[PDB]
Amino acid sequence: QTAEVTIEDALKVVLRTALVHDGLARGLRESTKALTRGEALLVVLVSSVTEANIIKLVEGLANDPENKVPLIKVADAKQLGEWAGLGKIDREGNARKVVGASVVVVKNWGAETDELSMIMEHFSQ
Amino acid sequence: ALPEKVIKAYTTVGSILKTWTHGKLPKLFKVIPSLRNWQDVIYVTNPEEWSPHVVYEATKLFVSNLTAKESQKFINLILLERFRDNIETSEDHSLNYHIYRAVKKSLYKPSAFFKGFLFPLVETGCNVREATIAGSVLAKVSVPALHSSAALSYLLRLPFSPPTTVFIKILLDKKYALPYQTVDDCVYYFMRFRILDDGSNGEDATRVLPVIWHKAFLTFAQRYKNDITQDQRDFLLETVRQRGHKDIGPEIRRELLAGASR
Amino acid sequence: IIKIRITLTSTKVKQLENVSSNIVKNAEQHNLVKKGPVRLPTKVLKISTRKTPNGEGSKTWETYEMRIHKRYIDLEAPVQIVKRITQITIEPGVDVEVVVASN
Amino acid sequence: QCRVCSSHTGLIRKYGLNICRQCFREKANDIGFNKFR
Amino acid sequence: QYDQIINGYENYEEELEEDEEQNYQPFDMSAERSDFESMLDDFLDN
C-alpha cells in the first residue's frame, strides 16, 4: 500500500532498536526460511532492489498474504542496511562502511513492542 | 517424580560419561537440548562428577543449541558450580584446560555467560584466584559492545573490591563504543570514592585504593574523555585532586583536560 | 515403654567418665531400671613412621599411637526422657549413640 | 592426590585420606593424631 | 536499547524469579517432541 516517510523512519528506528535485542534476521535466504518456519513476525522489503525475481516470489506472497505473513515497504536498501546496523554505523563520531541489505526480518521484538503494535495496526488499514 | 525408565536410562548414560575423553557424544545426551524439560533429566545424570571433556562438550551443545535464558540457567546451575569446585578443590588452586575451554566457549552467548556465571560469582565469594581466572577468560573472548556495556554497568554498581576492579579492567580495555549513559554510570562509579566535605561519606571515601584503580581511571579517562559533560569533567577533576596517584595521576588530569564536552 | 541402649565412644577418659557419671546419677535419681556402664577394652591404634624423611643415614623407625575407649549403658525410659537426655548430653569429645531396637 | 601442596609423590592411601606424608607430619595434631609413644 | 538490558542485569535475580514463576512446567512425556521416545528405544537397543 501507500508508505509514508514517518512510518518508514519509525520502522528504521525499530530496526535500530531490534538489532540490539539480537532479534533481526538479515539475509535473503534467512528471510525465505524465516517465512517458511513461521518465525517471521515482520519481513521488511526494499522497493529499490535491482533484481526482482526473488521480489516477485515475495510479491506472489504479498498480494495474497497468509495469517502469519506481515510485509512492509521502505525506500532504500543501503539505508535499510544502515538502520539494520550492517551498512553504516554512524553515531556522533564513528563510521564504518559495509554494503547494505535488501530484506530484514524481525524475529524478536524487544524494546519496540508497542511501536511494532501500532505499525501493524497501521498497515492493516 | 520422573518415570523409572528415564531414571535408569539417564543413570546408565551418567555411568557412561565418567571417563569420556574423545569421540562422539551419546545419543540420549544429545537430545537433552531438544527437550522441553531439561532440568529433571540432567539431575539424574549426577552433574557433579562429570569429566572435563563432557563439561566442555556439554557447554558447546548447551550454548550453541539453546536460548539465552536456557543457557543462563544451564551455566548458573552447572558450569559456575563446577568452575567453583574445580578451583577450590584443585590442589594448586588451578583450572583444568578443558574447563578453561568451556568457560571460554560459554561467552559466545554473552548475556547468558554474564547473568549466569559472572554476576553470581562476584556476590558469592569472588576471591583473587577466581577473578584472575575469569578476567583472563573475559580478556580472551571477543564480546559485542552492548553486552560489555551492560556487564560493565553492573560492575560499576557493585561495592568495591580489587577483583571487581580487575573485571572493570577487562571490560574497560575493549575500546568499544559505549552509550553515553554507560559513560555516565562510569562517572557515577567514580563519584563514590571521592571525599565529600558536606557531611556525607562512606567506607569508599577514605579507603586505600591500589595502583589498579588509578590505571582504571587512566583507561576510562583516555578512551571516554570525549563522551562526558563539563560538570562530570569538573567532578572527575575533583576526584583527581583528592585521590590522585604519584605516577599515574598527572597523566590522567592532562588527558582529562584534553577532552571535549558532549 | 521403650528400651534404649546408649553407647558412648570417646578418646579422652575424663570427659567420658564425667558423662557416664552424669548419666548414672541422672538415671538413678528419678527411678529408672538400668544396667551399669559396661567397659569395653581400650583400642590402641598404632602406625609406623620413618625417622628419615630424607635419604641420609640408616633406616630406623618410630610409632605413633592412639587410645580409644568405649562404654555402653542400657536404659529403660519413656520417649520424652530419652529426647531430653539426648538434647542435654551433647558434649565435645564424647560421642553419644541411641539404639532403639534390642535385636 | 594431596589436596594441600599438589603432591603426586609420598601418598598414603589409607582410609580414603590421600594426604602426602610431608603434609601429614604437621597436620596430624589438628586431625587428632598426637605423639604418645 | 539500554533500559531493556540493565533491568535484566541489575535485577537479574528478580527477573529470573519472574521467569521461573511464569514459565515453569512439570515433566510431561507427550508434550515433548513426538520422536523422543523413538530415540529412547534406539539407544537402549544399542
Ligand SMILES: [Zn+2]
Ligand atoms: Zn602435601
